[PDB]
Design a protein around this ligand. Sequence first.
Ligand SMILES: [Mg+2]
Length: 342
Amino acid sequence: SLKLTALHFYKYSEPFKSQIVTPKVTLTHRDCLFIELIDDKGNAYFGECNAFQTDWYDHETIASVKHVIEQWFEDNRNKSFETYEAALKLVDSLENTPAARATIVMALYQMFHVLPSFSVAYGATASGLSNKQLESLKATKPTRIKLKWTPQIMHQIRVLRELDFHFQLVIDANESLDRQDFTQLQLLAREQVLYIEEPFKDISMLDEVADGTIPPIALDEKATSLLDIINLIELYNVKVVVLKPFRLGGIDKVQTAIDTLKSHGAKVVIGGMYEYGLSRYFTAMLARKGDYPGDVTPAGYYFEQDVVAHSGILKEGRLEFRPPLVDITQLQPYEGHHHHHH
Ligand SMILES: [Mg+2]
């Protein structure tokens, strides 16, 4: 049997190697909330929250999650549970706050499973084709390349198809295309594109092009909740869904979501978002459940220093993962007398 006796909040905030610049936000650092739950035997387990400092991506933030988890602990502390299933029952009331729920579930999961060491396929992401990017692709030989849609897309695919290795091609249009892009979208269909992520901000635009004359469509930004994903699938021609575990409420909600989405005729790709090494491990762990290889980010892609080192090290086309062990000296108390600044 187990009982949760203590809860501590920490913060980690490393700078992005390359400043993040998107229409929705500018990020210099990845502020992140971490929780630590200690059981009645003094065993500590950590959870990584995927919420951001502000609501540019979602309504849940680091602050809102902290408050939710803090209250949750007050209501569940000292309660005994003997199984993972029983543990999950305590968070059933947090389904309205998926980011908070997912953070707690990440910790609970570790209390009942022996974490394996494993690898996942390496999928490269290119926002363009600089020499640095091209040389990286040639040296690493990814089995999948996700190219960002830009005015140079066709001129860049021409270069990629001359690489000496075969790969699946995915295009990410970032909800940026318009009616003037129809012709190129149809031409892209002849380039063996596995799927194109979010061609239009207004998904209804899909009804304006002949079905089957453009690449398979995937939801990413629009894959907000299982219910909403199903609603979009039933209304528009969607074939692929990029699922982020935290948006579903956590690790335990992934399989059921995948089964449901498959019953609706959609394929699933597990993905992450600016994660540190702890959450990255679990996103990678779930990757195998998908119909296509997961969208797992390599170690060191965003941050020079991580809270969990060697989490997703690229080796001969695959990302290697080890059971995640948080380096506590990297974490800082979230608030209180022990939260210091210099
Ligand atoms: Mg995307």
